[PDB]
Design a protein around this ligand. Structure first.
Ligand SMILES: COc1cc(/C=C/C(=O)CC(=O)/C=C/c2ccc(O)c(OC)c2)ccc1O
Length: 337
Protein backbone atom coordinates (compact mmCIF):
# COMPACT_ATOMS: atom_id res chain seq x y z
CA UNK A 1 0.00 0.00 0.00
CA UNK A 2 1.48 3.31 -1.22
CA UNK A 3 4.94 1.88 -1.97
CA UNK A 4 5.06 0.43 1.54
CA UNK A 5 4.47 3.72 3.38
CA UNK A 6 0.74 3.28 4.01
CA UNK A 7 -1.06 0.07 5.01
CA UNK A 8 -4.60 -1.17 5.58
CA UNK A 9 -6.86 1.66 6.83
CA UNK A 10 -4.76 3.98 4.60
CA UNK A 11 -2.47 4.87 7.52
CA UNK A 12 1.15 5.94 7.13
CA UNK A 13 3.37 3.42 8.91
CA UNK A 14 5.12 5.50 11.57
CA UNK A 15 8.78 4.50 11.93
CA UNK A 16 10.21 6.12 15.07
CA UNK A 17 13.24 8.15 13.95
CA UNK A 18 12.33 8.89 10.32
CA UNK A 19 13.00 12.39 9.00
CA UNK A 20 10.63 14.36 6.76
CA UNK A 21 11.69 17.00 4.20
CA UNK A 22 14.94 17.46 6.16
CA UNK A 23 12.82 19.16 8.82
CA UNK A 24 10.57 16.88 10.89
CA UNK A 25 12.08 14.04 12.94
CA UNK A 26 9.22 11.65 13.73
CA UNK A 27 9.51 10.68 17.40
CA UNK A 28 6.50 8.53 18.23
CA UNK A 29 2.81 7.81 17.73
CA UNK A 30 0.86 9.80 20.32
CA UNK A 31 -2.67 9.10 19.10
CA UNK A 32 -4.86 7.23 16.63
CA UNK A 33 -8.39 7.55 15.37
CA UNK A 34 -10.64 7.64 12.35
CA UNK A 35 -8.88 10.71 10.88
CA UNK A 36 -5.61 8.78 10.90
CA UNK A 37 -2.73 9.24 13.33
CA UNK A 38 -0.99 11.85 15.45
CA UNK A 39 2.79 11.70 15.80
CA UNK A 40 5.08 13.55 18.16
CA UNK A 41 7.91 14.95 16.03
CA UNK A 42 10.73 17.49 16.31
CA UNK A 43 10.75 20.56 14.06
CA UNK A 44 14.49 20.90 13.49
CA UNK A 45 14.06 24.20 11.65
CA UNK A 46 12.19 25.95 14.47
CA UNK A 47 13.79 23.61 17.05
CA UNK A 48 10.56 22.71 18.83
CA UNK A 49 8.32 19.74 19.53
CA UNK A 50 5.17 19.50 17.42
CA UNK A 51 2.25 17.16 16.94
CA UNK A 52 1.46 16.08 13.38
CA UNK A 53 -2.03 14.92 12.40
CA UNK A 54 -1.41 12.51 9.51
CA UNK A 55 -4.70 12.04 7.66
CA UNK A 56 -5.55 8.78 5.91
CA UNK A 57 -4.95 8.29 2.18
CA UNK A 58 -8.71 8.19 1.51
CA UNK A 59 -10.52 10.92 -0.38
CA UNK A 60 -13.22 11.86 2.14
CA UNK A 61 -10.78 11.94 5.05
CA UNK A 62 -8.74 14.38 2.96
CA UNK A 63 -11.79 16.55 2.25
CA UNK A 64 -12.71 16.61 5.95
CA UNK A 65 -9.14 17.57 6.84
CA UNK A 66 -9.34 20.32 4.22
CA UNK A 67 -12.53 21.67 5.81
CA UNK A 68 -10.65 21.62 9.12
CA UNK A 69 -7.62 23.39 7.64
CA UNK A 70 -9.82 26.13 6.19
CA UNK A 71 -11.57 26.58 9.55
CA UNK A 72 -8.22 26.72 11.37
CA UNK A 73 -6.75 29.24 8.91
CA UNK A 74 -9.93 31.30 9.27
CA UNK A 75 -9.40 31.26 13.04
CA UNK A 76 -5.77 32.28 12.48
CA UNK A 77 -6.98 35.26 10.42
CA UNK A 78 -8.75 36.84 13.44
CA UNK A 79 -6.38 38.78 15.71
CA UNK A 80 -7.66 38.56 19.28
CA UNK A 81 -6.30 37.06 22.49
CA UNK A 82 -9.36 34.77 22.65
CA UNK A 83 -7.95 32.76 19.74
CA UNK A 84 -5.20 31.63 22.13
CA UNK A 85 -7.63 29.17 23.73
CA UNK A 86 -7.73 27.22 20.44
CA UNK A 87 -4.98 24.83 19.36
CA UNK A 88 -2.72 26.55 16.83
CA UNK A 89 -2.18 25.04 13.39
CA UNK A 90 1.49 25.75 12.69
CA UNK A 91 1.58 24.29 9.16
CA UNK A 92 -0.20 22.02 6.71
CA UNK A 93 1.43 20.15 3.84
CA UNK A 94 1.13 17.04 1.70
CA UNK A 95 3.69 14.28 2.26
CA UNK A 96 3.57 10.85 0.58
CA UNK A 97 -0.14 11.05 -0.27
CA UNK A 98 -1.05 12.13 3.28
CA UNK A 99 -2.32 15.52 4.39
CA UNK A 100 -0.32 16.47 7.48
CA UNK A 101 -1.42 19.15 9.95
CA UNK A 102 1.29 20.47 12.26
CA UNK A 103 0.15 21.63 15.70
CA UNK A 104 1.68 22.87 18.92
CA UNK A 105 2.59 20.11 21.34
CA UNK A 106 0.63 20.58 24.57
CA UNK A 107 0.40 18.64 27.83
CA UNK A 108 -2.24 16.08 28.79
CA UNK A 109 -5.99 16.17 28.31
CA UNK A 110 -8.50 16.86 31.07
CA UNK A 111 -9.48 13.18 31.20
CA UNK A 112 -5.85 12.41 32.03
CA UNK A 113 -6.12 15.04 34.77
CA UNK A 114 -9.24 13.29 36.06
CA UNK A 115 -7.32 10.00 35.98
CA UNK A 116 -4.41 11.47 37.94
CA UNK A 117 -6.87 12.15 40.69
CA UNK A 118 -8.49 8.82 41.59
CA UNK A 119 -11.43 10.13 39.56
CA UNK A 120 -12.16 12.29 42.61
CA UNK A 121 -12.34 15.34 40.33
CA UNK A 122 -10.52 18.63 40.58
CA UNK A 123 -11.25 21.58 42.85
CA UNK A 124 -14.11 23.93 42.02
CA UNK A 125 -11.53 26.70 41.67
CA UNK A 126 -9.73 24.78 38.92
CA UNK A 127 -13.15 24.00 37.43
CA UNK A 128 -13.82 27.75 37.52
CA UNK A 129 -10.56 28.53 35.69
CA UNK A 130 -11.25 25.82 33.09
CA UNK A 131 -14.83 27.05 32.65
CA UNK A 132 -13.73 30.66 32.15
CA UNK A 133 -11.20 29.63 29.50
CA UNK A 134 -13.75 27.36 27.79
CA UNK A 135 -16.44 30.07 27.71
CA UNK A 136 -13.86 32.48 26.26
CA UNK A 137 -12.99 29.91 23.58
CA UNK A 138 -16.68 29.43 22.75
CA UNK A 139 -17.03 33.22 22.59
CA UNK A 140 -14.22 33.30 20.03
CA UNK A 141 -16.04 30.57 18.10
CA UNK A 142 -19.28 32.59 18.33
CA UNK A 143 -17.72 35.42 16.31
CA UNK A 144 -20.13 35.84 13.35
CA UNK A 145 -17.41 35.70 10.66
CA UNK A 146 -16.37 32.41 12.28
CA UNK A 147 -19.59 30.89 13.68
CA UNK A 148 -17.85 27.57 14.27
CA UNK A 149 -19.33 24.59 16.11
CA UNK A 150 -16.67 22.33 17.59
CA UNK A 151 -19.17 19.41 17.41
CA UNK A 152 -17.09 17.19 19.73
CA UNK A 153 -16.28 18.89 23.03
CA UNK A 154 -15.05 16.38 25.61
CA UNK A 155 -12.29 16.22 28.27
CA UNK A 156 -10.08 14.33 25.81
CA UNK A 157 -10.28 17.31 23.42
CA UNK A 158 -9.34 19.89 26.07
CA UNK A 159 -5.60 19.74 26.69
CA UNK A 160 -3.38 21.50 29.21
CA UNK A 161 -0.81 23.99 27.95
CA UNK A 162 1.75 23.26 30.66
CA UNK A 163 1.25 20.42 33.17
CA UNK A 164 2.05 22.76 36.07
CA UNK A 165 -0.16 25.65 34.92
CA UNK A 166 -3.95 25.85 34.58
CA UNK A 167 -4.10 27.14 30.99
CA UNK A 168 -5.97 24.93 28.52
CA UNK A 169 -6.57 24.72 24.77
CA UNK A 170 -9.36 22.92 22.93
CA UNK A 171 -8.24 20.65 20.09
CA UNK A 172 -9.72 18.30 17.46
CA UNK A 173 -11.70 20.41 15.02
CA UNK A 174 -12.09 17.45 12.67
CA UNK A 175 -15.82 17.14 13.31
CA UNK A 176 -16.17 20.94 13.44
CA UNK A 177 -18.22 22.97 10.97
CA UNK A 178 -19.38 26.52 10.40
CA UNK A 179 -22.94 27.49 11.29
CA UNK A 180 -23.90 27.50 7.61
CA UNK A 181 -22.00 24.45 6.35
CA UNK A 182 -23.39 21.81 8.69
CA UNK A 183 -22.79 18.49 6.95
CA UNK A 184 -23.67 15.64 9.32
CA UNK A 185 -25.97 14.50 12.13
CA UNK A 186 -24.81 12.13 14.93
CA UNK A 187 -22.22 14.78 15.68
CA UNK A 188 -21.20 14.84 19.33
CA UNK A 189 -19.87 12.29 21.77
CA UNK A 190 -22.73 10.52 23.52
CA UNK A 191 -22.10 11.66 27.11
CA UNK A 192 -21.80 15.26 25.89
CA UNK A 193 -24.41 15.17 23.10
CA UNK A 194 -26.90 18.03 23.19
CA UNK A 195 -30.64 17.29 23.34
CA UNK A 196 -31.48 18.85 19.96
CA UNK A 197 -28.94 16.53 18.32
CA UNK A 198 -30.52 13.50 19.98
CA UNK A 199 -33.90 14.72 18.71
CA UNK A 200 -32.68 15.28 15.13
CA UNK A 201 -33.20 19.04 15.27
CA UNK A 202 -31.23 21.77 13.50
CA UNK A 203 -28.32 22.23 15.89
CA UNK A 204 -26.16 25.31 16.35
CA UNK A 205 -23.35 26.65 18.56
CA UNK A 206 -25.33 25.83 21.73
CA UNK A 207 -24.51 22.11 21.56
CA UNK A 208 -20.98 23.11 22.60
CA UNK A 209 -22.46 24.89 25.64
CA UNK A 210 -24.34 21.71 26.57
CA UNK A 211 -21.13 19.70 26.22
CA UNK A 212 -19.30 22.27 28.36
CA UNK A 213 -21.94 21.90 31.07
CA UNK A 214 -21.50 18.14 31.21
CA UNK A 215 -17.72 18.60 31.08
CA UNK A 216 -17.60 20.98 34.04
CA UNK A 217 -19.80 18.68 36.12
CA UNK A 218 -17.54 15.76 35.22
CA UNK A 219 -14.42 17.79 36.03
CA UNK A 220 -15.61 18.52 39.55
CA UNK A 221 -17.24 15.17 40.34
CA UNK A 222 -14.72 13.00 38.47
CA UNK A 223 -17.48 11.03 36.72
CA UNK A 224 -19.63 11.69 33.64
CA UNK A 225 -22.88 13.43 34.54
CA UNK A 226 -24.75 11.67 31.69
CA UNK A 227 -23.07 8.28 31.20
CA UNK A 228 -25.48 6.97 28.59
CA UNK A 229 -24.64 3.80 26.70
CA UNK A 230 -27.04 4.46 23.79
CA UNK A 231 -29.09 7.36 22.46
CA UNK A 232 -32.32 6.65 24.37
CA UNK A 233 -30.35 5.78 27.51
CA UNK A 234 -28.50 9.10 27.28
CA UNK A 235 -31.77 10.99 26.83
CA UNK A 236 -33.30 9.17 29.81
CA UNK A 237 -30.33 9.93 32.06
CA UNK A 238 -30.68 13.55 30.94
CA UNK A 239 -34.39 13.69 31.82
CA UNK A 240 -33.49 12.12 35.19
CA UNK A 241 -31.76 15.42 36.02
CA UNK A 242 -33.61 18.00 33.89
CA UNK A 243 -37.13 16.58 33.61
CA UNK A 244 -39.18 16.33 30.41
CA UNK A 245 -38.12 18.76 27.65
CA UNK A 246 -40.26 21.84 26.78
CA UNK A 247 -42.95 20.42 24.43
CA UNK A 248 -42.85 23.81 22.63
CA UNK A 249 -39.73 22.34 20.93
CA UNK A 250 -40.84 18.67 20.99
CA UNK A 251 -43.75 19.84 18.75
CA UNK A 252 -40.80 20.35 16.39
CA UNK A 253 -38.67 17.31 17.27
CA UNK A 254 -38.27 14.86 14.35
CA UNK A 255 -36.96 12.12 16.67
CA UNK A 256 -39.41 13.03 19.46
CA UNK A 257 -41.21 9.69 19.13
CA UNK A 258 -37.89 7.94 19.85
CA UNK A 259 -38.06 8.84 23.55
CA UNK A 260 -41.45 10.40 24.32
CA UNK A 261 -45.15 9.79 23.68
CA UNK A 262 -47.75 12.52 23.17
CA UNK A 263 -45.72 14.50 26.32
CA UNK A 264 -44.36 11.76 28.59
CA UNK A 265 -41.64 9.12 28.56
CA UNK A 266 -41.82 5.50 27.38
CA UNK A 267 -42.09 2.38 29.50
CA UNK A 268 -38.99 0.22 29.92
CA UNK A 269 -40.38 -3.32 30.19
CA UNK A 270 -36.63 -3.47 33.93
CA UNK A 271 -35.60 -1.09 36.70
CA UNK A 272 -37.11 2.29 35.86
CA UNK A 273 -35.08 5.46 35.55
CA UNK A 274 -35.31 7.99 38.35
CA UNK A 275 -38.52 10.03 37.81
CA UNK A 276 -37.98 13.23 35.82
CA UNK A 277 -36.12 15.95 37.68
CA UNK A 278 -35.59 13.83 40.80
CA UNK A 279 -31.81 13.53 40.36
CA UNK A 280 -31.01 17.12 41.24
CA UNK A 281 -27.58 18.57 40.56
CA UNK A 282 -27.69 19.77 44.20
CA UNK A 283 -27.02 16.21 45.40
CA UNK A 284 -24.61 15.29 42.57
CA UNK A 285 -22.40 18.28 43.40
CA UNK A 286 -23.19 18.06 47.11
CA UNK A 287 -23.90 21.75 47.65
CA UNK A 288 -24.65 21.24 51.35
CA UNK A 289 -22.62 18.06 51.99
CA UNK A 290 -19.06 19.29 51.45
CA UNK A 291 -18.98 18.73 47.70
CA UNK A 292 -18.35 15.48 45.84
CA UNK A 293 -17.54 12.89 48.48
CA UNK A 294 -17.65 15.37 51.36
CA UNK A 295 -14.01 16.22 50.65
CA UNK A 296 -14.37 19.97 49.99
CA UNK A 297 -15.89 20.83 53.38
CA UNK A 298 -14.47 24.10 54.68
CA UNK A 299 -12.36 24.70 51.56
CA UNK A 300 -12.23 28.23 50.19
CA UNK A 301 -14.19 28.66 46.98
CA UNK A 302 -16.21 25.60 48.05
CA UNK A 303 -18.83 27.29 50.23
CA UNK A 304 -22.52 26.53 49.78
CA UNK A 305 -22.93 29.82 47.90
CA UNK A 306 -20.14 28.93 45.45
CA UNK A 307 -21.72 25.53 44.81
CA UNK A 308 -25.09 27.23 44.25
CA UNK A 309 -23.56 29.63 41.72
CA UNK A 310 -21.96 26.66 39.97
CA UNK A 311 -25.31 24.83 39.96
CA UNK A 312 -27.02 27.86 38.42
CA UNK A 313 -24.34 28.18 35.74
CA UNK A 314 -24.53 24.48 34.86
CA UNK A 315 -28.33 24.60 34.61
CA UNK A 316 -28.07 27.71 32.43
CA UNK A 317 -25.67 25.66 30.28
CA UNK A 318 -27.91 22.56 30.28
CA UNK A 319 -31.00 24.39 29.00
CA UNK A 320 -33.21 22.26 26.76
CA UNK A 321 -33.93 25.29 24.56
CA UNK A 322 -31.02 26.08 22.21
CA UNK A 323 -32.27 29.67 21.95
CA UNK A 324 -32.46 30.28 25.71
CA UNK A 325 -29.34 28.26 26.56
CA UNK A 326 -26.73 30.64 27.94
CA UNK A 327 -24.37 32.21 25.40
CA UNK A 328 -20.60 32.41 26.03
CA UNK A 329 -20.56 36.15 26.78
CA UNK A 330 -23.32 35.98 29.39
CA UNK A 331 -21.82 32.75 30.73
CA UNK A 332 -18.67 34.77 31.44
CA UNK A 333 -20.74 37.36 33.37
CA UNK A 334 -22.17 34.69 35.69
CA UNK A 335 -21.70 35.11 39.44
CA UNK A 336 -19.76 31.82 39.51
CA UNK A 337 -17.00 33.79 37.76
C1 LIG B 1 2.47 15.69 28.32
O1 LIG B 1 2.22 14.39 27.81
C2 LIG B 1 1.64 14.31 26.58
C3 LIG B 1 1.15 15.38 25.86
C4 LIG B 1 0.57 15.20 24.61
C5 LIG B 1 0.06 16.35 23.86
C6 LIG B 1 -0.82 16.34 22.88
C7 LIG B 1 -0.76 17.23 21.76
O2 LIG B 1 0.04 18.15 21.76
C8 LIG B 1 -1.64 17.03 20.56
C9 LIG B 1 -2.07 18.21 19.81
O3 LIG B 1 -1.68 19.32 20.13
C10 LIG B 1 -2.94 17.97 18.74
C11 LIG B 1 -4.00 18.73 18.49
C12 LIG B 1 -5.04 18.48 17.50
C13 LIG B 1 -5.61 19.52 16.78
C14 LIG B 1 -6.60 19.28 15.85
C15 LIG B 1 -7.03 17.99 15.62
O4 LIG B 1 -8.00 17.74 14.70
C16 LIG B 1 -6.47 16.93 16.33
O5 LIG B 1 -6.98 15.70 16.02
C17 LIG B 1 -6.80 14.66 16.98
C18 LIG B 1 -5.49 17.17 17.26
C19 LIG B 1 0.49 13.92 24.09
C20 LIG B 1 0.97 12.83 24.80
C21 LIG B 1 1.55 13.02 26.04
O6 LIG B 1 2.03 11.97 26.75
Amino acid sequence: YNDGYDDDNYDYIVKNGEKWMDRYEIDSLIGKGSFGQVVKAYDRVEQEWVAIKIIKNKKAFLNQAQIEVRLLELMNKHDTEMKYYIVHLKRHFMFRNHLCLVFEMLSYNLYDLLRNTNFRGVSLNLTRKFAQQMCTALLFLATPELSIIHCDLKPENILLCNPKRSAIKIVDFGSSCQLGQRIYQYIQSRFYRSPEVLLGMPYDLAIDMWSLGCILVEMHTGEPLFSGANEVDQMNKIVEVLGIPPAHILDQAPKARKFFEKWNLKKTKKREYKPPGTRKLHNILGVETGGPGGRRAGESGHTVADYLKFKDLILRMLDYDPKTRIQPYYALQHSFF
